[PDB]
Structure formats: structure tokens, C-alpha cells
Amino acid sequence: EFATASADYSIAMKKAAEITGAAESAMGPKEGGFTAGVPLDTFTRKARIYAPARTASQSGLARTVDFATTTPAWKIEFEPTAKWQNPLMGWTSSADPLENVGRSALVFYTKEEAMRFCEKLGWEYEVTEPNKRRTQRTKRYMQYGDNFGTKRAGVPDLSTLPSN
Amino acid sequence: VVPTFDWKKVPVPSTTAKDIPVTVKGATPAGDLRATSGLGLGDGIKNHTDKWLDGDKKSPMEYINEVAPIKVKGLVVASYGSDDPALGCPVEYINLKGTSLENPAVCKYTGNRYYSDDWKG
Amino acid sequence: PPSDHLEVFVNEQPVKIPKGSSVLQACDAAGIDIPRFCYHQRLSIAGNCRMCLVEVEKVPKPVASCAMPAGPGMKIKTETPMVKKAREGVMEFLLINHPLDCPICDQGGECDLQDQAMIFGSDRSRFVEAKRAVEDKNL
Amino acid sequence: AKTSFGGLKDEDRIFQNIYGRHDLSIKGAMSRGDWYMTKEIIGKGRDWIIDQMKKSGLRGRGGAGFPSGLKWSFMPKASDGRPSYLVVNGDESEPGTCKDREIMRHEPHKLVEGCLMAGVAMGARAGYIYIRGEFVQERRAVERAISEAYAKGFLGKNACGSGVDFDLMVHYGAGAYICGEETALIESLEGKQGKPRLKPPFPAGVGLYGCPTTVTNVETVAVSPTILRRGPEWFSSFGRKNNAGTKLFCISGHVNRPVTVEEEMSIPLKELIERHAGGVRGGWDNLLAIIPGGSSVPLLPKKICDGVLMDFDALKEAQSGLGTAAVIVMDKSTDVIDAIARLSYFYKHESCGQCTPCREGTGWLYDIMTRMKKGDARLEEIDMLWEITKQIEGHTICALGDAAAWPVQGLIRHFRGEMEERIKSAGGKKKLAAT
Amino acid sequence: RGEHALRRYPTGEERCIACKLCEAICPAQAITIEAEEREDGSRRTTRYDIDMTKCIYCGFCQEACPVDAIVEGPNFEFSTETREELLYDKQKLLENGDKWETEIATNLRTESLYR
Amino acid sequence: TNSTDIFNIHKDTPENNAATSFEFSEATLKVVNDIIARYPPNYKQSAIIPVLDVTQQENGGWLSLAAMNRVAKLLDMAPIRVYEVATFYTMFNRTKIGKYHVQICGTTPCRLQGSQKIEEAITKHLGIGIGQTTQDGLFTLGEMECMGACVNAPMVAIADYTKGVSGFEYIYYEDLTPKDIVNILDTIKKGGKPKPGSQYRLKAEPAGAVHGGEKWVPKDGETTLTGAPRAPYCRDLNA
Ligand SMILES: Cc1cc2nc3c(=O)[nH]c(=O)nc-3n(C[C@H](O)[C@H](O)[C@H](O)COP(=O)(O)O)c2cc1C
Ligand code: SF4
Ligand code: SF4
Ligand code: SF4
Ligand code: FES
Ligand code: FES
């Protein structure tokens, strides 16, 4: 029996991605970036390929690598660029063309997707493998009965009994 | 064995020591840590209201400081910010025990003070 | 080894889990993120939030997946009407005394309570009584 | 196969000195049949006593009715490095129930011998008794009986000259009805607030200090030597199937002769109350409702009460419970809504608050009931109250949520007409100013 | 829906508590907010600016605010000779609110039956 | 929780503060040490409740912060657990009370018997309500839950703190009318000892009752266990 989030449009997005002929397309390095028509200096900067780690504020795990096949969770970012403030108001002033386009739009299911995207676009890229979460607990308090086992202070000594 | 650590012998830089943000009595212990942002540092501003208010106009802090605390029967008070609840703030339930005219409970939404002489005092 | 990895079923899915694992951990291995409030990875099992209640075959009561050990051959259900009913009731019991402090609360936007209420809770309240007022503390 | 039950003979009553009319020292108890042939009964064997208790079919008198013979066998028959504990629940904070108080005040020797027999039959190295804190004179009598038994060699090393070693210690609470639960009592005993644990694990698997421990009611323990001495066959001679034996009954309320009396099981309420209690104040026709099992079980109206028997398997099918077999009687001049509201207020004050649903819903239930009492409520809010009761029930850590939810459930189910009449009637004293 | 304005309570204290719902909801990105705790422990703004040359007057800010702090006043004749005069700060918004409070309160006494 | 204790946190007072001074008496220390022997040394924390109670009589009927500190230092445990236990149990009073502590059950079986009438009589005579104390520091009124004396309801328990731990008395007074409780209070005031238990019968044996909470109406009916006590007997254990 197969059941992997089998009650949504995502299946319709699973297929039409594996269409024969359409699934064999390939482009060379920097080739897609030529088709972009953007200024050529865009490819000179460095980019970070990664998945953001789970925030400490919440126990939520949806926007994490745990549901990797469910949602595209690989992000491409750029080095932040010079920023300053408006003399008249104090608002943050900057000239970065690539300021937010990645953190808002660029989302990928696997790291290899972003690798191919950068290669076909010519963006030099860094890979940062996210740390794996640990599910195995500690030896102490391993089970609910460990909160009240004998390991806390050892076996009770029967020396204070009447007649000892 | 395990001797105590002398906290008073620790050297403290004078410049940093004299710019710690302290607070009036208000809603907290007097002189506790006050959260501050980087705004006003370039202009060398160490007052919250001075960041946005200009001149010797009456500040909202002075306005609310002119309202005497309110005496209400019971242990829990309900604050709406207006006579009709829908025209003010969300309803707040504020503890009244252990509160006096000297040490009342101030509204977190509106800043109004309340107290009750019902907790056996 | 004497089968250190035992087998259970969660919503008719066979999942291999280590011995001594909980139903919470099994559902985590099943790809389900059960709502929870008191359990933490690095802490002991508290099990007072009642938000981890799930349904198991041959069990008339909801069981504490944050605390219930998994037995071989166990069946776990997470989408039954009683599961959602219990989740909504627990959220309602959470929110009845909670002060309406979201506009002034700093955790608004990253509040587990708020998101869990949005997902596993209802939209309306039938509580119209006076709440419990708690004085703040200095630490 | 007898079909009519009741009329228990005095010569068959287990507790001959339930009122303290006789001497309370060890000489009187020994002359009254207690501490008789104790050593030889011990020498019979662990499995022999287990079998004798299993044949009796005696149920746990704490309020659950579990078969004690299977209960006492749950302790392991091997040794692994941990000592075995026996603990007796002697709080009796259930409203309407005052039988264990009488047992501890007037018949402590029977309880001590039952403790020794239970420890022998389960291998508990030492014993502990958790008495209610307010029961100070009862505690003093228990301590006196324990010291007297020690003085004659009944307790300690070589118990009664049998080779087994048994110890008994006394602890008293500090005013918490929550401590009446097994795990909560263990927790208070450990030196913490009486906040219960979760099952699994079990006290027999992991109990006090992580050691095997069985928690038992005072009444269940006390009757054991008499059952052992007089026979499981004699014990089974009373009651219906799976409901054999006698029971101590506490009758209160609007009763002509309130009393704590011993009687055969399965006796009808009408027989049990009209006789041995003088009937209802103002007559049986003045009866309105009765809670037959303390305060946690659903109450029954006059129609259900007239005809039903005092049995675990008779009150359960009536959507009620035998509970502690404590009788509370209310007449027609009584405000039933006020009674249930006061019970809810008591439960609200008694909830430990460890888990969310009970902790947060006791006050909600109390306020709902209080508004119902003044009639400041609506018809659909009754169904809302029932929905809330369903919300709490079976969703908490311990059964105290069920104990608080059940009385209002039966109240609604059997007197929804009274509540709606009150709700409408408030309009005759509240809507006249709205117009 | 006219000129945005900041409202107070009748004792004189600002209604805005810097919950930043208005900035979050604003699709015009015309609201800039900075805030910290006041010297009395009160949670108040340190910078409250709305760009009228950028504000679209949608009123979604007035819909989002749960304390009736930000309101679009009945003032609509506020054209200026320079664009800089329309860069509304906290002080000018408070001035506008103090000016137009009575009319706004009267309108709310009507709109409350619908809002 | 109970009456007269509205706070679960410490409150500063010249009487009760961090500077409060308390020390056990030699008899109290001996009694506590004897109580200590009831539990294994590696589980020495289990005796906290009786020690707290004994300290409560020793101080005069309530527990101070310094007393809690001394108890914690005696049992070698953190003060936080001691504070939790003290705030967890009803009998433990954290505030100064009168010489005598009056506790009334408010549970429904007691309520039906006329509990509010007894409370009203106490209020009218002693002049104080629940959570209050007389100006002379003589009587302290409090409300309690079911005290396990429902067959003799209504009932009242009064605690004595005028004679310390060795002279501590916790006496039940049952089957009461307003006249009964008023006369009991007056006898206590004049220095006499009111009789314990019921005011119209010995124990829970069948007798009359209190009709309407104001008058005792004796009634005659069948009573059990009126014959000679049964002789010792045991069956044949063999087969
Ligand atoms: C809220 C609550 C209060 C209880 N109070 C008592 C009690 O006061 N005395 C008692 O013997 N059992 C009490 N019990 C039952 C105990 O949990 C447990 O079942 C009992 O000690 C076992 O007695 P048994 O051996 O007769 O079955 C209470 C249970 C609950 C849920
Ligand atoms: S049901 Fe109530 S008393 Fe029982 S554990 Fe939960 S909160 Fe505590
Ligand atoms: S104006 Fe209203 S919505 Fe905007 S920050 Fe202030 S209180 Fe929040
Ligand atoms: S009216 Fe619309 S554009 Fe103007 S500040 Fe409010 S949300 Fe922004
Ligand atoms: S995680 Fe707290 S009840 Fe399950
Ligand atoms: S009802 Fe008052 S002692 Fe039980």
C-alpha cells in the first residue's frame, strides 16, 4: 500500500514533472544565464545553497528537512551588500539587485535541484549539509518510568526498620 | 572547600556602567533592565520619548502620571479602555490582591491603575 | 539481535522503530508532527499537556503518545473524529483562562500556542467568565 | 441459589465492634477472634492464600471493584534486587463515606492482621499505612495497636514464630483528597506533592522508590483474615454472581436514622434505607434523589432507586456506580442544583491541577453551575455543559476529571426539566426590568 | 478613508501599543515602525512613520488595528507644495489625531454598529 | 489551598521575613529524629510532611519562612520543594492565626444538615466571617471539605495550639445545633473542655437526627450488633 500525502494536488505536481522527453532536457554551465539577459556581473558573486535550520522559538517541524519530499526546502542566498540610512527619514538604503529574490522565491526540493539551477545559470555555489536531528533519547529519563526508578538514589536500605 | 566568589571585586568599565537603562517604579521593580534599540545612539539620545517627541510639549508619560489610582471592589478587575468595550482595547483581567494605593496594579493596555482593599487589608 | 527494531502500525503504515521508543517518536518516524506542548527532546517526559492524545485499537481511552510506550502489533490512528474532538477540546481548555495579550505579547508570530490553535483548534469561544489573574515575578 | 438478599445475621457480620461498645485493647480483640491461628495461616503458603482470596471473589473496596485475588497476584514471584512494599490507603476523603474512619478508630487489630496477611501473601518486606491527616485519634489508636502487636511478637523478625519478617509504619496526610489515588499517594509518600503518575508503568512494576508496591483499601485488607478464617465458601454465600460478600454502608442525608452499618450485598436501596435507617425523613414519598456511591458516581431519581439493588453490576447498568457504597439522601424541599453546584465547587477546590483539562475546567463547570443556580443561563447552554463534560471525561491524567464530570451528567440526564424550569423562571425576576 | 492619524485615550495616553499589525498588514510598505519599552515599563513606539506619498488609503490598517489607534481621518484637503511635507512622522500624526479626535470619535459612535 | 492564605508567594512582614528566627526544642528535635527513623536514609526526603506538621504545632499553629528554611536544612533538601509542599496542602497555614483554629465542613452532605445555619450562628456570636480572626486572637474560623463524619453531619473540628506539640489536640465535634456549637465555644472560652464527638450519641450507631439543622429528633428502630460478641473461630485449613 502506497500513502505519501495522497489526498492533494501535489500528486498532480509529482507527475508532469516526469514526462518523457520533458524529463531529459539539459543545459551546460552558464548557458541558461546567457538566456537571462540580466547584466553579466550577476554571476560574479557567490551564493549559499542550504536549508535553514529549525528556529529555537517553536517546536514546529513542517518547514524543516523532515518533510523534505513534501515541500521544496532548499534556499539560495547572496552575500549581503552595502546598506545605510536615509538622511531625512532614517530608512534603510541599499542598491542590491539581488537583495530578496532568493529568500522569497528560490525554493527547491533537493540540493541537486539548486545545484543544477546554479550550474545552468553559472552561479558559483557553496553546499552546506544541514545537521541531522537526533531522535534517540538519553539513558536517564529514557522512559516515563525512569523518572521514578531506583537510579535516583539507589535501592532503599532496610536499616531504619524496627528491629533493624 | 568550594569558597564563595566575590562579585564586588569584579572591575566594571565606567563608560558602560553609567549608561545602563533603568526604569521608574511603573509596572516593574525600580531600576531594572530597560530594553533599548540602536535608534537615538547616533544622535546621542538616552530618553525613550525624546527619540520622537520634540520640544517641551507635555509627554504622554506626564499625562498618565496625573491620573490617581482607582479603587474597585473585588479581586479581579476588567479593563476595556472605554465605557463601551468595542471602542477600546481587548479586555484585560488584572490581579488586585496585594495591591494598595501606594502599590496598585497598572493597566498593561491603557496604563490606568487599580487597587482593592479586599485582600484582608 | 532479539529484534531491537520492533514493528507497529500508525494509520495502516508499517514503521520500524527502536525498542523503548514512544508513540510520539513512532509518529515522528511515520512523518506525522503530532501537536504537543509539554514534551521536549532534551527533557524528561512530563505528559501534562494532554495534547498528544491519540487513538489505539482495543483501547477505549485516548493514550498519551508523549508518554505511552509502543507495543508490538499496535495500531495508531491520528485523524479519527475523536482525535480532532479531543484536540479542539484541549485547545479550548488551554485558551479559556489565557489572557488576551497577543497584541502586547512578544511571541506573536512565533507562538506555538497560536499556530496549534489555528490548525488543531476551532474559531469560536463559548467562555464568557472572569479569567484567572496572575502577578508577575522577578528572576 | 438464593434470590432474596439482605437481613445479615449478627453472627455473620465481620466487625463485631464497629461501634466501640467493647474494649479496644489487644486482649479484647484477641478474645473477639482476632490474631487467632495467625502463624499457621502464614505457614500455609503464598500461593495457597492467593488461591483462597481468588476463590472468595472479593473486589477492591476502594471504589473500582477489581478482583483482589488477581490484583494481589500481580506482584512478581521472584527477587531482582528491590524490596517489596505494601501500602494501605486510609484517607477516606470521599464525601459521604466514613467507614474506614470507624474501622481505624474501633477495629485496628483486624486491619493490622490483614496487613500482615497481605504482606505474607505478596512477599512485601515492610508495610506502610497512609492515614488521613485529620484522623488524629484514629492514627493514635492505630499506633497503639501496632505497638501492642509488636510487643507480642506479631510483627518484626520471625513474625508470630513463622520465619518471615514483616514491618509496619504509619504515615498521615495533610488534607488532600487527591492523595487518595494510588500513584498520588505513592508520590506524597516519597516526599513530593501528591501529583499522580501515568499508567503505564504500574505500581507493581515500578512503585514507591521504584520498587514493587500494591495499594489497598482499609476495608478490603481488614476482611481478609476473617475471609481466610471463615472461608471463601462462606464469603461467597452472600450476594449475586461476581458480587459476593458483605459491605459497610454509610447512610446520610435526610435520613431518619443516619448510620454506618454492615449489610449483605445486593440488598435493595428501599430495604436498606427503610430498615436499619428509619426510612426517609417525611416518608419514602418525600424522597427526591439519592447518590448511592459517595460523590463521584451518578445519582438516581425516585423511579430508578425504587427497585434497584446495591450492587456493582446493578448500579452500573443503571448508568451509575456502587462507588464507596455511601448513601446520601435528598428530599423534595432540597435544591438539587445547589447540591450539585456545591459538589462541583468541592471538586474544583480538590483538583490538583497537574493536567490541563481538569485544572482549567473545574472553574468553568463551577461557574456554569452557579449561573444555572440563579437561572442566568440558556437552554442550549445545557447541551454546552454536557459537551464540556464529554470534553473532560477520559481525556485527563487521572480519573478525577471523570469524578467531577459524572455528577453533573446524571443531574442533567435525570432532572433537565428542573434546570429548564429554573432557567425560564429567572425571566420572571430578570426580564421585568429589561422591559 | 482619508488622512491617516494616531489616536489616544481620553486620559491622554497613546492608543498605539506597537503591536506592528498595521505594518504587517500594509501592502504599501509605507509604514516604518521602531519601538521599545518606555521608562515606565510601557510598550510604546520610538518611531512611527507612514509615507502618505506611498500610502494607498486602503484602510486595511484601520481594519487590522485592535485598539482603534490608527484611523483615516475625515481630513482630505491636505495637499502640500513640497513632497517632503507628506513624510508623516509620529509627531504630526499625533497632532492630526488631537485635532480631529472629536469627529473621529463621533464617526466611531456610528461605525461601531457595523465594525 | 485554604482560608487566610490568598498568596502562594512570600510576603514581607516584621513578623515573618528573611530575618525570622526559629529553632527546634530538644523534645521537638527528638520527636522529629524519631520520625526520621521511619524511612530509609537514602530516601530521607519522604518525612517532610510530618516534620512540617510538627514544626507547625511547635511555632504555635502556622509555619514561617524561617521554619521552612530550617526544616529544609534539617532534611537536606532544596527549600523550593518545601515551599511547594507547604503551598500544596490545606492544613499547612503560612500566616499567623489565632490560638484556636475552627474548621467547618462545607460539603453537600454537611450542607443539607444545616451547615449554613451553624456558620451563621458562628458569624453572629464570634463576630467574624471565614478567613477572619477575633480581635483577641482567640478563635480562627475556617471552611473545610468533607471531614469523614457525614453520618454525624453537621460537624466541626477545632485545633488547639495553646499547649504545643505535646498538648496538641484535634477534636471532632459532631451532631451540632447552633446552641451546641455556641455552648462549645463558650466552654472553650471559659477554660473548660467540651466533650468530643457527637452531642447526642456516642458514635455512628443508629440514633435520632437533626431535623432542619435546628433540633435533635430521637427515633427508635432496629439496631444491629446488640448481642454477645462472637467467639474466636477458625476452620480446618487442611483437606
Ligand atoms: C480521586 C480519587 C480519590 C480516591 N480516594 C480514595 C480514598 O480516599 N481511599 C481509598 O481507599 N481509595 C481511594 N481511591 C481509589 C484508589 O485510587 C485505589 O483504587 C484504591 O487505593 C484501591 O483500593 P482497593 O484495593 O480496594 O481496590 C481514590 C481514587 C480516586 C481517583
Ligand atoms: S484530573 Fe485534575 S486532579 Fe487529576 S491529575 Fe488532572 S488536574 Fe490533577
Ligand atoms: S497603530 Fe495599531 S496596529 Fe499599528 S502598531 Fe500601533 S497598535 Fe498596532
Ligand atoms: S490606509 Fe492602507 S496604505 Fe494607508 S497606512 Fe493604512 S494600510 Fe497602509
Ligand atoms: S506531550 Fe504533553 S501530554 Fe503528551
Ligand atoms: S460531608 Fe462533611 S464530613 Fe463528610
| DSSP H stretches of helix in chain F | 26-36, 48-59, 65-75, 79-88, 108-112, 115-126, 178-190
Q: Are F109 and F153 in contact (CB under 8 A)?
A: yes
The grid coordinates listed for E41 are 515599563
CA D367, CA D347: separation in Å to the nearest integer?
A: 13
Contacts of D322 (CB under 8 A, 6+ apart): D65, D292, D293, D297, D310, D311, D312, D315, D316
Q: How far is the CA of E58 from the centre of ligand 4 (A)?
A: 5
The grid coordinates listed for B108 are 498593561
Contacts of D307 (CB under 8 A, 6+ apart): D268, D270
Chain B partners (3+ C-beta pairs within 8 A): C, E, F
The closest alpha carbon to F233, from D107, D16, D263, belongs to: D16
Task: Provide the 8-state DSSP code for B69.
Answer: P
Q: Which of A145, A155, A163 sits opposite D201 (nearest CB)?
A: A145
CA F145, CA F2: separation in Å to the nearest integer?
A: 10
Q: Are E2 and E76 in contact (CB under 8 A)?
A: yes
CA D399, CA D317: separation in Å to the nearest integer?
A: 20
Q: Which of F49, F146, F211 sits opposite D174 (nearest CB)?
A: F49
CA A6, CA A15: separation in Å to the nearest integer?
A: 13
* Residue F77 annotated as part of some ligand binding site: no
- The per-type count for chain E, helices as H runs and strands as E runs, is 3, 5
Task: Provide the 8-state DSSP code for D92.
Answer: -
Distance of CA A11 to the CA centre of its chain: 22
Tell whether ligand 2 has an atom less than 6 A from the beta carbon of residue D396. yes
- 3 state SS of F102: strand
Grid-cell match 436499619, residue found: D276
Residues annotated within a binding site of D for [4Fe-4S] cluster: 352, 355, 358, 398
The grid coordinates listed for F230 are 462472637
Q: What are phi and psi of B115, to 5 degrees?
A: -160, 160
Q: Is A91 on the interface with E (CB under 8 A)?
A: yes
> Given phi > 0 = left and psi -120 to 50 = alpha, else beta, which region is E67?
alpha
What residues of B are in contact with residue E17 (Cβ under 8 Å)? Answer: 89, 109
Q: Are F105 and F147 in contact (CB under 8 A)?
A: yes
CA B37, CA C103: separation in Å to the nearest integer?
A: 20
What is the number of the ligand closest to the CA of D222? 1
Burial degree of D361 (CB within 10 A; 0-12, 13-18, 19+) = buried
The closest alpha carbon to D125, from E6, A157, C51, B44, belongs to: A157
Residues annotated within a binding site of E for [4Fe-4S] cluster: 4, 16, 19, 22, 26, 55, 58, 61, 65
CA A14, CA A2: separation in Å to the nearest integer?
A: 14
Query: With touching defined as 3+ CB pairs under 8 A, do chains F and B touch?
Result: yes
Query: What is the nearest CA distance from D377 to chain C, expressed in angstroms?
Result: 12
The grid coordinates listed for F192 are 473548660
CA D130, CA D117: separation in Å to the nearest integer?
A: 18
Burial degree of D43 (CB within 10 A; 0-12, 13-18, 19+) = middle
How many C-beta atoms lie closer than 10 Å to residue F191's C-beta?
A: 6
The grid coordinates listed for B104 are 496598585
Q: Are D232 and D53 in contact (CB under 8 A)?
A: yes
Q: Which residue of F has its CA nearest to D253?
A: F109
Cβ-based contacts under 8 A for chains A and E = 7
Q: Is E42 on the interface with B (CB under 8 A)?
A: yes
Tell whether ligand 6 has an atom less than 6 A from the beta carbon of residue F144. no
What residues of A are in contact with residue D205 (Cβ under 8 Å)? Answer: 145
Q: Are F185 and F162 in contact (CB under 8 A)?
A: no
Bridge partner list, D249:
D261
Identify the H or E element spanning F81: helix F79-88
- 3 state SS of F154: coil
| Strand A75-78 to A46-50 pairing | antiparallel
Cβ within 8 Å, pair E36-B36: yes
Contacts of E96 (CB under 8 A, 6+ apart): E3, E5, E6, E73, E75
- Output the residue whose Cα is nearest ligand 2's atom 2: D358
What resolution in Å is listed for this PDB structure?
5.4
Grid-cell match 487597587, residue found: B115
Query: What is the nearest CA distance from B100 to chain E, expressed in angstroms?
Result: 18
Grid-cell match 517526559, residue found: C45
- Residue D200: asked if its preceding bond is cis (omega within 30°), the reply is yes
Q: What is the dihedral of CA D98, D131, D115, F228, to 10 degrees?
A: -40
The letter for the amino acid at B33 is L
How many C-beta atoms lie closer than 10 Å to residue D121's C-beta?
A: 26
Residues annotated within a binding site of D for FMN: 61-62, 71, 89, 92-93, 182, 217, 220
- Residue F154: asked if its preceding bond is cis (omega within 30°), the reply is yes
Q: What are phi and psi of E68, to 5 degrees?
A: 55, 40
Cβ within 8 Å, pair A88-E84: yes
What is the number of the ligand closest to the CA of D132? 1
Query: With touching defined as 3+ CB pairs under 8 A, do chains A and D touch?
Result: yes
Cα dist. D80→A155, D76, D200 in Å? Answer: 11, 9, 20
What residues of A are in contact with residue F37 (Cβ under 8 Å)? Answer: 160
Q: How far is the CA of C23 from the centre of ligand 1 (A)?
A: 29
- 3 state SS of C13: coil
Cβ within 8 Å, pair F37-A160: yes
Burial degree of F76 (CB within 10 A; 0-12, 13-18, 19+) = exposed
CA D196, CA D355: separation in Å to the nearest integer?
A: 10
CA F127, CA D264: separation in Å to the nearest integer?
A: 49
CA D184, CA D194: separation in Å to the nearest integer?
A: 5
